[PDB]
Every structure is written in structure tokens, then in C-alpha cells.
Design a protein around this ligand. Structure first.
Ligand SMILES: O=C(O)c1cccc2nc3c(C(=O)O)cccc3nc12
Ligand SMILES: O=C(O)c1cccc2nc3c(C(=O)O)cccc3nc12
Lengths: 352, 352
């Protein structure tokens, strides 16, 4: 048993101090008894002592991104030896859309915690809406699946999804294939159309192209006017005006937000409500578990508030440690309202 | 709370008192405080009284298939109120066949009972192999996914899958889009490869066409001789010598079995291990919960043992009640293990 060690971390985690939390988990991960086999096996390859010289969140700047590894590393070793017997491990992959695919492990406690964080703020808000959720997103080996199912149960209906293979979509628009992308996009909208038109759907998770498509279908729009309380847009292909126009002129009773995948850190980040009065899309991460740095593409250097840079993300929780993953997007750096740790993002945009 | 009603139904199953079990569930499903809104309402369209006029399994012949009907029915109404608060309804579909589809509801406790029935005989027996599962099958809204996930957690390793979008294969297939069925399969095969190579998996779930393009790869085949222990093949494209050959010749000691989805009975029947003895693939179902009848296409009369007929599957449990689904496959009918209600099936093929 180590569950009272573990509480201490989750405790430190919100009495807002980076510091103590970082050290506590640096200990969790590298100390002999409790650590991952993987990190324990990695300690001797580091040129610094993860205990002695490593105090601030920022102080993790000294690990490099170990994703190369996770393609080969047999998943059983990723699992912190000090988690309970019934922790309930699970493998998720990170888009083997070419350069193919990186293995990771997550846990129910973890996803539960992610979600309570996303949803605080409206979980308990009087007259908050209720109903099923249609999530038009990957499930299968993709950890968004499992994160979305979890939200859907807390909103009082059932979680519904579609058949979607993002890996073929990709390997085909990259592969240059025009007709396919249209035909498969079709088949996606058709699936979403059916469920919206045959079960009462209160909550839709989808993406601008797909929404954009549904809005072009007279019967569906009408139906959306009747039943959607809130839509989440995922991707980075987001045009703020378009959304303002939808929100005010078409689905005026439906709120909007955006979601940002950071598969690398075993989670997703959430936007504020995007309204007509909104002037950028703004994101927060589940800090300190997940934290963003935003850095210059030339000099690896955290850039100033207000400027564009490259998203660097870091997961540090009792379940998993992933320092300092370069994500493949740029964002405006903004002071992160609480702590105490990690940055806000605004207006995420793709790379080169 | 109704733990004692469920207990009785379970216990009448576990000692095969088929009439008790059926009579109990008619009460359970048809009565104002325990049953699903759907059945309660559906009663006013029947012309017999489930509670009084139904005494044995055959007696359900009085019911008609109520499937084409679960496209628009509200999912929440499928849920028997007699189930507990905590029972975790989750929503699954089938019949993305042409474009439909039919929503149903499943529960952890059912999924669990099912798997337990699938897995006795081996679960415990000495020396039973054990490790990771790779399941080349759909997740998303396909109960099949959920099913295997369960199984994999009981074989001491984790659950790997792949993106795979069976409606696409299907539509394409029956478009004549012959071009990209073959492209797509390559994609599935590739994704399988990867995991086969990068994580050691003990058990694979797939299908004859894919395993076919798969054994065209010499180094996957070496990995396979090395790591696989058990292979479950589903779909109904089962070619028998083709397997017996594969198992005898190509990879000579992985064991091989078949699996058959009756998705609108919320479950999968299992075959007897295909030995090199095997003269027909034979499936057991999870009786009395799931029971099969095999019926002549003109008279709906139950065929003699050994004639091939059109298959009818029925699901009756404390979780759901789907009487008499016209599935879309023929089989040779066999005696089921006497004591148990329902036929054994052999050498299933599809319709025309
Ligand atoms: O999911 C998000 O990223 C998200 C972001 C911002 C506000 C949100 N408000 C929600 C409400 C509500 O405000 O009643 C109900 C259900 C889901 C909601 N999701 C929200
Ligand atoms: O999965 C199936 O459909 C199946 C059917 C028949 C025999 C099976 N035997 C298995 C064994 C074993 O016999 O040791 C181990 C792991 C999985 C097994 N799966 C089997």
C-alpha cells in the first residue's frame, strides 16, 4: 500500500505550489520502491540528480522529450510500481499517422481527475443543461475517446460516437488524396447526421469541417436549433468569426468551446466559452499535472507574454511522467491564471 | 433497490431452470416498477400477456423481432428501472449496414457475465498462456470492441487495438469501390504489424482476410510463431481447411477459434477450439441469456438437426430483452449441450 503517500501529492497539487509537488513526484518516480521501471531504468542515463538539482516546475526544463522510446518500450514498464493492485491500466497510442505509433498507459483515477477539473466550473452550476453526448471523435486506441466518455456520463445521458479512423484521413490528405478525403468526410457527416436526427443529442463534440458540413443540411440545422446546448470544437483549424456567426445567428441557444489535444500528456486542454464578444480562443491546462511552456523555435527559450512560440507540454502526475514534449503547434503565450504554474494558450496554430 | 429479484434470475440461470428464468424475466420486464419504459409501452401492441401466457423459451415465439424500431426509440427507455443507480448503461449500435443504425444499451455486469461464460474452460486451467491482447476489431459504437476489452483484462496483459472503420469497408465494398477496399486493408494490416513488432502480444483477434494479407509478411510470421498463443477469428468468411492448413503448417502452435457476433443480442457466441480433427466450426452461445433457433426460410419452423436454416437469436436477461431477432445468416443447426436451452450452430454463412 502507498495510497496515503499518493493523497499527499493530489493535496499539494491544489494548494498551488509547483515546488513541493514537483519534488514529491520526482521522488515518486525515481525512488526505487515506487517508480516506474521505465524511469528507474532511465535515472542512470541522466546527467543530473532528479532529487537534488530539480526544485521548480521550470527546473524540469532539463529532461528531454523521451518519445523516441515509447515506440519500443514494452508498456508494462511504464506503470509506477506504487499504484494499487486495482489501478486499472490502459494503453493508448499517439497517431501512427506516418512515423507509426507511440504506446502509453492511463488509469481511471487519472481520467476521472482530468475530467473533474475540466468540468468544475459548470459541473454543479444551477440549471446546467443535461443529456446525451455525441462524440464524433476517434475512440479505439485514442485517449480522447476515453476522456470524452468520461465527461459524457457526468452530464446525464449516454455517450454516443461514430466510426472514425483519423489515421486514414491523415495518411490520405498527406498522401495527396482528394476524392477520398471528401467521400470519407461525407460518411462522417452522415453518421453524425443520423444520431442527431434519431436520438435527442444535447452535446456535440466535433470539428470545424464536420460542423461546417452539418450546417449545410437544412433538416440537421433545424434539429440542432432544437437540441444542442453546447458544442466542443477540436483541432486547430478554428476560425473565430465563423464561430461567432454560428453562435449568434444560427445556434443562438447553444454555447461553444474548443478542446486541444495533448495526447503526449495524457489529456486535453480547455477553452473559455467562445462568444460573439470573444477576441481570441483561450486555453487552460490541468495544472500542474499538465503544464505548457511556449518557446522560441530557434533558441528553445520561453517567449514573452503576448508572443507566438512553440508549444511544449509536460505531464507530471502519480501515474506517469512525460517531460517536455514538443507539440507540433504554435500559440500566443499568456500568464496562466492559477497557479503558480504553466501557461495559458491562445489561438493555437499548426507547424512549418 | 431489487438485488433479490436479480439474484433469483441469476440463480435460476445457473442451475438451468429454464422456465423459472423465463417466467421471472417476463415479470421483471413487464411490470410497472422494474421494466424498461420501452417494453412497458410495447405491451399495448401485443396480443398475449408476457406474464401469464409465456412459460418456456419456445413460448417467446409469440413475440416478433422489434429491432427495426430501435433506430428511433430513446435509448434511455431501453433501461429496466429495476437495475441499480450504479449500473453504467453504455450505448452500442449495429446496422451501420447500408446506413441506419440501431441503438441498444449494455452494462458492465452483463458484459462481465458474458465474458465469464466465454472464458470458463480456460481461465483457470493449469499452464494457460497469458499476456497482451491485440484486437484488430472496431471499438466506437461496436459492442464487440467492449467485449474483447473485457476478455483482454482477464488474460493478464493489456488491450491493444487499431483504428478500423467497418462501415467504410462495407459501403465501399457494396459501392463496387474495389480500388480502396484493398488500399484500406493494407492500412489495417500495417497497423497490426506495428503492434506485433513493437509490443509482445500473446493473443490476436482478427479476421480471415486480414490474417491472410498478414501471413504474406515473412517477419511478421516469424514474430507470430514466436509470440501468439491463441487467435480468434470472427466475421463469417470462415474457410476451414484454410485455417487447418494455417495452424498445422504455417504457425504450428497457436490455437485457433472462431467467434460470432449477435450484436443485437448484445453478445458473441464462441466456437470449440478448431483442432486438426475439426469437421465443422461449432458455436456455443450463452444460454439461457442468449439462445438460438434455426428455422426454415419458408415456414419459420425449427429445422431438423443437421439441416441448415436461417438463424434466430434471442436475448433475455435482467439487462435487456430482445426476442427473436432475424439475424442475417444461415447455419447448420446442432443439439446444444443438453440441459441448456437453445441450439448449437455450425458452419454459418451469410444470406442472398
Ligand atoms: O467542455 C468544455 O470545454 C466547456 C468549456 C467552457 C464552458 C463549458 N460549459 C459547459 C456547460 C455549461 O456551461 O452549462 C455544460 C456542459 C458542458 C460544458 N462544457 C464547457
Ligand atoms: O477466445 C476464444 O474464443 C477461445 C475459444 C476456445 C478456446 C479458447 N482457449 C483459450 C485459451 C486456452 O485454451 O488456454 C487461452 C486464452 C484464450 C482462449 N480462447 C479460446
Amino acid at each position: 500500500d502507498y495510497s496515503l503517500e499518493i493523497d499527499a501529492v493530489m493535496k499539494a497539487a491544489q494548494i498551488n505550489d509547483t515546488n513541493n509537488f514537483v519534488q514529491a513526484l520526482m521522488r515518486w518516480h525515481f525512488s526505487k520502491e515506487t517508480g516506474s521501471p521505465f524511469w528507474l531504468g532511465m535515472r542512470e542515463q541522466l546527467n543530473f540528480d532528479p532529487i537534488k538539482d530539480v526544485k521548480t516546475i521550470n527546473d524540469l526544463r532539463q529532461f528531454s522529450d523521451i518519445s523516441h522510446c515509447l515506440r519500443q518500450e514494452p508498456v508494462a514498464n511504464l506503470v509506477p510500481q506504487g499504484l494499487p493492485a486495482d489501478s486499472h491500466p490502459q494503453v493508448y497510442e499517439s497517431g501512427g499517422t506516418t512515423g507509426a505509433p507511440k504506446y502509453v498507459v492511463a488509469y481511471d483515477a487519472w481520467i476521472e481527475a482530468l475530467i473533474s477539473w475540466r468540468m468544475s466550473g459548470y459541473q454543479h452550476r444551477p440549471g446546467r443543461p443535461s443529456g446525451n453526448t455525441l462524440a464524433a471523435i476517434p475512440t479505439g486506441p485514442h485517449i480522447v475517446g476515453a476522456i470524452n466518455k468520461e465527461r459524457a456520463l457526468r452530464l446525464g445521458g449516454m455517450f454516443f460516437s461514430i466510426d472514425i479512423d483519423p489515421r486514414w484521413v491523415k495518411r490520405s490528405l498527406s498522401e495527396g488524396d482528394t476524392a477520398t478525403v471528401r467521400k470519407y468526410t461525407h460518411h462522417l457527416v452522415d453518421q453524425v447526421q443520423n444520431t442527431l436526427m434519431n436520438q435527442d443529442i444535447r452535446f456535440l463534440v466535433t470539428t470545424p469541417p464536420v460542423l461546417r458540413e452539418l450546417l449545410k443540411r437544412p433538416e440537421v440545422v433545424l434539429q440542432m436549433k432544437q437540441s444542442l446546448a453546447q458544442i466542443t470544437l477540436g483541432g486547430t483549424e478554428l476560425n473565430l468569426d465563423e464561430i461567432k456567426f454560428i453562435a449568434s445567428e444560427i445556434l443562438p441557444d447553444c454555447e461553444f468551446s474548443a478542446s486541444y489535444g495533448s495526447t503526449s500528456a495524457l489529456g486535453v486542454s480547455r477553452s473559455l466559452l467562445i462568444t460573439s464578444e470573444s477576441q481570441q480562443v483561450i486555453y487552460d491546462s490541468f495544472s500542474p499535472f499538465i503544464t505548457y511552456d511556449v518557446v522560441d523555435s530557434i533558441t528553445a527559450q520561453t517567449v514573452e507574454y503576448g508572443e507566438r512560440g512553440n508549444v511544449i507540454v509536460t505531464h507530471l502526475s502519480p501515474w506517469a511522467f512525460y517531460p517536455r514534449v514538443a507539440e507540433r503547434d504554435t500559440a500566443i503565450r499568456l500568464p496562466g491564471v492559477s497557479g503558480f504554474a504553466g501557461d495559458r494558450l491562445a489561438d493555437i496554430e499548426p507547424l512549418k
